Amino acid sequence: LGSNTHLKQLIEISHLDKEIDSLEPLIREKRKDLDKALNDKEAKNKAILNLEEEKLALKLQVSKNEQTLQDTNAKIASIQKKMSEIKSERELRSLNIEEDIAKERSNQANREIENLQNEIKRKSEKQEDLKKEMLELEKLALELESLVENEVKNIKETQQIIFKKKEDLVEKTEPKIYSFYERIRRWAKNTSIVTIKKQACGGCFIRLNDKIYTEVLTSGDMITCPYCGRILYAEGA
Ligand SMILES: [Mg+2]
Ligand SMILES: [Zn+2]
Description:
- The chain has 237 residues and is mainly alpha-helical.
- Helix content is 78%, strand content 3%.
- The chain is built from 5 helices and 3 strands, in the order ααααβαββ.
- The PDB classes it as gene regulation, chaperone.
């Protein structure tokens, strides 16, 4: 089926595969502060541009309010002109009140415009803030980058050395045995070879029946789990 020396050979290889893989989180850890700075800087850059779209919409409102304020003031002017020419003096008190409503609407527009302009200003202040933060983050990225990339390069060279060792080991392995390993590794990755714990597959955790548990411990072969297909071994048999 396999044989214990073939099992040994695959255990050595599978450990070198795990080494190559488990160094991937290491590269990520090494980059964490640097990637954080770069990603925060990009997020703040987007926030500046978003705030610019909001300032644009607000500036459109300022302009719309400004047109109605122009209309309102023309109406005031027109009411006052009518008061000058008058007619009688029924309407002097009447027009004073017409004018008063129009004055109030013009006071509302002036307040609304001032309010919008205030919101615009707060956004421009926030933009200046973000811009300063972006520069601190660039300063940060530039500091971290020299070492981080050297550290990562040294780690890559280690994965190559590990792979070179794998080549040497694979070259000494019965091609059929290796391929049986690789076929399972396609889907199972680094849970390809597992130990028995309790009486269950160390990979799918479903209890192995008496016949199979005995077979793994007693016989000098290499057995696969009947539920998931993984290679199984007793840590010492
Ligand atoms: Mg008056
Ligand atoms: Zn299993």
